[PDB]
Design a protein around this ligand. Structure first.
Ligand SMILES: *[C@@H]1O[C@H](CO)[C@@H](O[C@@H]2O[C@H](CO)[C@@H](O[C@@H]3O[C@H](CO[C@H]4O[C@H](CO[C@@H]5O[C@H](CO)[C@@H](O)[C@H](O)[C@@H]5O)[C@@H](O)[C@H](O[C@@H]5O[C@H](CO)[C@@H](O)[C@H](O)[C@@H]5O)[C@@H]4O)[C@@H](O)[C@H](O[C@H]4O[C@H](CO)[C@@H](O)[C@H](O)[C@@H]4O)[C@@H]3O)[C@H](O)[C@H]2NC(C)=O)[C@H](O)[C@H]1NC(C)=O
Ligand SMILES: *[C@@H]1O[C@H](CO)[C@@H](O[C@@H]2O[C@H](CO)[C@@H](O[C@@H]3O[C@H](CO[C@H]4O[C@H](CO[C@H]5O[C@H](CO)[C@@H](O)[C@H](O)[C@@H]5O)[C@@H](O)[C@H](O[C@H]5O[C@H](CO)[C@@H](O)[C@H](O)[C@@H]5O)[C@@H]4O)[C@@H](O)[C@H](O[C@H]4O[C@H](CO)[C@@H](O)[C@H](O)[C@@H]4O)[C@@H]3O)[C@H](O)[C@H]2NC(C)=O)[C@H](O)[C@H]1NC(C)=O
Ligand SMILES: *[C@@H]1O[C@H](CO)[C@@H](O[C@@H]2O[C@H](CO)[C@@H](O)[C@H](O)[C@H]2NC(C)=O)[C@H](O)[C@H]1NC(C)=O
Ligand SMILES: *[C@@H]1O[C@H](CO)[C@@H](O[C@@H]2O[C@H](CO)[C@@H](O)[C@H](O)[C@H]2NC(C)=O)[C@H](O)[C@H]1NC(C)=O
Ligand SMILES: [Mn+2]
Ligand SMILES: [Mn+2]
Ligand SMILES: [Mn+2]
Ligand SMILES: [Mn+2]
Lengths: 420, 420
C-alpha cells in the first residue's frame, strides 16, 4: 500500500531575500540571489520555471536603482543556458492587459521555450506559483517572483531541495500541467492522463533521506481543476497541518483574508479561519499569525485579524496572537513601485513544515495556481527547527507590530493600522 | 402537493415577565406570563399538555420567604383545579441530575394530573429543556418561562400565546407526544418514529394560517435530531434559514450564546450559528444586533467569542455586528433569591421573519437537548414581527443594555462577561 521510498541524498536549505536596510542584530541563510545563481551555474540538462511575472531589470520597472543589479545578473545568467544546451521551459501567467515582456523576449532569443498560461480563461484565476526545477534533481519553491525587487527590496522565504530527483520529478508533474495549458487551444481535461498522477500525497508521503535522517515529504497543488489522481489539494494539505498541531501554529503570510476576494457578490470563506479557531479552542494550540502590511494591503483584513486576536482566554487556553510585519522605507525606497513588504508564505508547527506560494485567501485554493511542500521529520535541529527560528526572529523583531500600534510610528505606509 | 391550509382564526400575543424594579418609561400592551397562564387555565375544558424542564412554583420549593412567589403559588393552585374538573392534564418533565423533592408534581398527581419524567440524559445525553403548554388542542404557550414562581416576578421572559389555532396546536402536540412516549418506563428512541408523529408543516411547506386577520406562514421546529420524525424541521435548520434569508437586519436576544458543545471533554468548537451571522454581515451587509444576558452564573468563556463577533464592524465592507449585554439589576435582597435577576429571552427577528425558541444558542441545544421554536413569516407592515422588533429595540436602547467595554462595577448586578 505504501509507495516506493526515495534513495536520493536530499538536502534542504531555507533561502531568504532580506531587503536593503532591514537588520537583525545577532541572528544567517544563503540569499535567494546566491541560491539562484548557484542553481544556474550548475544547470547542465534542464530548467523548468513556473512564474507569475518577469521584471528582472531597471528598464522593466522604469527605475534607475543600483539594487536592481542582482536581478539583472540573474537574467544575464538565464540567457547563457539554452546556448550551452540546457532545455529551458518557462510557464508564465497571462497578464491582465497589454504589457511588454522584455525578459521573456530576451530568453526566447537565447533559445529558451516560453508559454503564457491563460488561467483567467481556464479557472478565473492566475498562474501565481513560483518554482524552479533544475536537471530533474534540484528545485526552488517559495515566495520570490522573477523580479529584481524579489532579491533586494522585498522579504522572501523559499526552500532549495538539492540532490532529490524523486521529489524534483514529482514537482515536474505540476509544471507539465502548466506547460500543457500554455498551448493554443488548451482546455482543462475532464481527466488528466496517468503520467500527471502521483503516489506521493497526504495519505502516503514520499519517504526521503533529508540531511541524513528519514523524513516524509509531499507536494500539494492548486487549483482543483489542475489536480490529477493522487495529488493532494493545497487547501487539504494546509488544513491537515493546522488540524494535527498539538502545541503551536506559527503562520507568516503576506495576506490573510477569510473571503473569496474581488467577488461580486462578496463571499465569506472560513476554511482556514475555522481551522485556527478549532485548533486554539479544542486543543489549546498557541497560534501566532504574522501578517505583512504595506500601502497595498486590503483594508478589510484588519477587522478579520481583530476578530481572531479577540480569542485569547487564560481559562479555556484559547491563545491566538496577531502581529503586522512592516518593512521600513526611506524616501528613495518609497519611490520603487511595489517594494518594501514581506512576501513570505509559510507555516510551522511543533511537528510539521508547510512552505507555500499562495496567500491565505479563498481564490488561491479555488481558482489560482499554487504549490506547497509539506515535510515531517522525527527529531530536533532540522528544517522545521530552522523555519521556527526564522518565524521567531521576525515575530520578536522591531518590524512586527500589535494591531493597536499607531500607523504613524511603523516606518512605512500600513493600511491595517489606525491613526491611534 | 402543498398541504391543507388552516381555517382557524389564529391570534398571537407576545407575553413577557418583567422582573420587579425593571422599568421602561412610555414603552407595555403585552399581558404578563402570569396573566396569560391564568387565562389559559381558567378557559381549559378538555386537555392541558405541558413540556417542562423543572417545577418550583412555591416559596417552599426554593427555601425562600418572598411575597413575589405569590403569582407562582396561584398558578399551582389553579393547575390543581383542572383534573378534578375533568381536564386531561399531561406533564412531561426533565429527569433531574440528582435526587430532588418534587412537591409541585406530587400535588398535581394527587389532583389527578398525569406526570412522566423523561430521562433525556440516558436517551440523548441531554435534558428536556422545552417549555410549552397546549390547551384544549386549540391554544399554546411557547417561550422561555419555566414552571417557576421566579419566571413570573424575578426574571425576564419572552413567549408567545397562539389562541384559536387548533391546526398548529395539534402540530405542537405531535412534539409533546414524543416526550410523553419517552417518559414511559422501558422507552427507547425508535429507529423510525411511527407516521402519527410525522408533520406536513415545515420549512419547505409551512402552514398557511390566518394570523390576526391576514395570511401568514407558520411552522414548529424541534430538537434534538433523534426526536425528529419525517417532515419535522430541525430547530438548527429553521434558525439558520432565518439568518441565511435576512437581507436588512438580524436582532437576536438570547440568554447564552456560545459557539461550542458546552461542558464537552475534550472541548468542541461549534461555529454553525457563528459562521451564519459572519456570512450574513459580510456577504449581504446584514446589520446584526446580539443582545446577550449577563449575571453571576454567565460562563466566562462567552466574552472572547462575543468580542470576536464585535470586531466585525467596518464601514467599507458594510460588515456591522454589534453586541450588548442585558443585565437585570439586583439589590442585596433580590441577590438572595436563588437563580433570579436575569433575562431568559430566546428569540430572533429580521426584516421578514419571527423566530421564538426555548433553547440558548450553544451546540448542546441542537444535538442532545430538547427544544421547540415557532417560525412565522407574514407579508405586510406591522404584525407579530413588528411587535417583537419593538421589544428588542426597547431592551437594546434601555439603560439595562451595556457595551462589552462597560465596567463590571456599573451594571447593577454581578456580570462575568465584563472586564471591569
Ligand atoms: C393579535 O390579536 C391579539 C388578540 O386580540 C392581540 O392581543 C391583544 O392586544 C391588546 C392590545 O394591546 C391587549 O389589550 C391590552 O392589554 C394590556 C394588558 O392588560 C392586562 O394587564 C393590565 C395591567 O395589570 C396590572 O398590572 C399589575 C402588575 O403591574 C397586576 O398585578 C394587576 O393585574 C394590574 O391590574 C390589566 O389592567 C388588564 O386588565 C384589563 O383592565 C381593563 C381596564 O383598563 C378592564 O377593562 C379589564 O379588566 C381588562 O382585562 C389585563 O390583565 C392593557 O395594558 C391594555 O390596556 C390599555 O390599553 C387600552 C387600549 O389598547 C386602553 O383602553 C386601556 O385604558 C389601557 O390604557 C389593553 O387592554 C390584549 O390584552 C391582547 N389580547 C390578549 C387575549 O392577550 C394582538 O396584539 C394582535 N396582534 C397584532 C399584531 O395586531
Ligand atoms: C541540510 O544540508 C544543507 C546542505 O549542506 C545545509 O545547508 C547549508 O547550510 C550551511 C550552514 O550549516 C551553509 O554554510 C554557511 O553558508 C553561508 C554562506 O553564505 C553565503 O554568503 C556569504 C556572505 O554573503 C555576503 O557577503 C559577501 C562578502 O564578501 C558578499 O560577497 C556577498 O555578495 C553577500 O553580500 C559568503 O561568505 C559565502 O561565501 C562562501 O561560501 C561559498 C559557498 O557557499 C563559496 O563559494 C565562497 O567562496 C565563500 O567561501 C556564501 O556565498 C555562510 O555565511 C556560513 O558562514 C560560516 O562561517 C562564518 C565565518 O566564516 C560564521 O560566522 C558562520 O557562523 C558560519 O559557520 C556557512 O558557510 C551552506 O551555505 C548551506 N549549503 C547550501 C548548499 O546552501 C542545511 O542547513 C542542512 N539543514 C539542516 C542540518 O537542518
Ligand atoms: C549534492 O550532491 C553533490 C554530489 O553529486 C555534492 O557535491 C559533492 O560535495 C562533496 C562535499 O563538498 C564533495 O566531496 C564532492 O567532491 C562533490 N561532488 C561534486 C560532483 O561536486 C553536493 O555537495 C550535494 N549538494 C548538497 C547541497 O548537499
Ligand atoms: C378566540 O375565540 C373566541 C371565540 O371562540 C373569542 O371569544 C369571543 O370574543 C368575541 C369578542 O371579539 C365575543 O364576540 C364573544 O363573546 C367571545 N366568545 C366566547 C365564546 O368567549 C376570543 O376572543 C378569540 N381570541 C382570543 C385571543 O381568545
Ligand atoms: Mn502534520
Ligand atoms: Mn486547493
Ligand atoms: Mn425567512
Ligand atoms: Mn436541531
Amino acid at each position: 500500500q505504501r509507495p516506493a521510498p526515495c534513495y536520493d541524498p536530499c538536502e534542504a536549505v531555507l533561502v531568504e531575500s532580506i531587503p536593503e536596510g532591514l537588520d537583525f542584530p545577532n541572528a544567517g541563510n544563503p540569499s535567494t540571489s546566491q541560491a539562484w545563481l548557484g542553481l544556474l551555474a550548475g544547470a547542465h540538462s534542464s530548467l523548468d520555471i513556473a512564474s507569475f511575472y518577469w521584471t528582472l531589470t531597471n528598464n522593466d520597472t522604469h527605475t534607475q536603482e543600483p539594487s536592481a543589479q542582482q536581478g539583472e545578473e540573474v537574467l544575464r545568467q538565464l540567457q547563457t543556458l539554452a546556448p550551452k544546451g540546457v532545455n529551458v521551459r518557462i510557464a508564465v501567467s497571462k497578464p491582465s492587459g497589454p504589457q511588454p515582456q522584455a525578459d521573456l523576449q530576451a530568453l526566447l532569443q537565447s533559445g529558451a521555450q516560453v508559454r503564457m498560461v491563460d488561467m483567467q480563461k481556464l479557472t478565473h484565476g492566475v498562474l501565481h506559483t513560483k518554482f524552479w526545477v533544475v536537471d530533474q534533481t534540484h528545485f526552488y519553491l517559495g515566495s520570490a517572483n522573477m523580479d529584481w525587487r524579489s532579491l533586494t527590496q522585498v522579504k522572501e522565504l523559499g526552500v532549495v531541495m538539492y540532490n532529490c530527483s524523486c521529489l524534483a520529478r514529482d514537482l515536474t508533474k505540476i509544471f507539465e500541467a502548466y506547460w500543457f495549458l500554455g498551448q493554443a487551444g488548451s482546455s482543462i481535461p475532464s481527466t488528466w492522463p496517468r503520467f500527471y498522477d502521483t503516489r506521493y500525497n497526504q495519505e502516503t508521503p514520499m519517504e526521503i533521506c533529508l540531511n541524513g535522517t528519514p523524513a516524509l515529504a509531499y507536494l500539494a497543488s492548486a487549483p482543483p481543476p489542475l489536480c490529477p489522481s493522487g495529488r493532494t489539494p493545497d487547501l487539504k494539505a494546509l488544513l491537515n497541518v493546522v488540524d494535527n498541531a498539538r502545541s503551536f501554529i506559527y503562520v507568516a503570510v503576506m495576506n490573510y483574508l477569510p473571503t473569496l476576494e474581488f467577488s461580486h457578490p462578496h463571499r465569506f470563506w472560513p476554511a482556514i479561519d475555522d481551522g485556527l479557531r478549532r485548533a486554539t479552542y479544542e486543543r489549546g494550540v498557541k497560534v501566532r499569525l504574522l501578517i505583512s502590511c504595506w500601502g497595498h494591503s486590503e483594508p478589510s483584513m484588519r477587522a478579520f485579524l481583530l476578530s481572531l486576536a479577540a480569542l485569547r482566554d487564560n481559562h479555556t487556553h484559547s491563545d491566538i496572537q496577531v502581529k503586522l510585519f512592516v518593512v521600513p522605507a526611506d524616501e528613495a525606497q518609497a519611490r520603487i513601485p511595489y517594494a518594501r513588504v514581506n512576501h513570505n508564505k509559510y507555516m510551522v508547527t511543533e511537528r510539521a513544515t508547510y512552505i507555500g506560494t499562495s496567500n491565505w485567501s479563498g481564490n488561491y485554493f479555488t481558482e489560482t495556481a499554487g504549490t506547497s511542500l509539506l515535510v515531517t521529520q522525527n527529531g530536533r535541529g532540522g528544517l522545521r527547527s530552522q523555519l521556527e527560528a526564522i518565524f521567531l526572529r521576525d515575530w520578536d523583531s522591531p518590524y512586527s507590530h500589535d494591531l493597536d500600534t499607531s500607523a504613524d510610528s511603523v516606518g512605512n505606509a500600513c493600511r491595517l493600522l489606525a491613526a491611534q
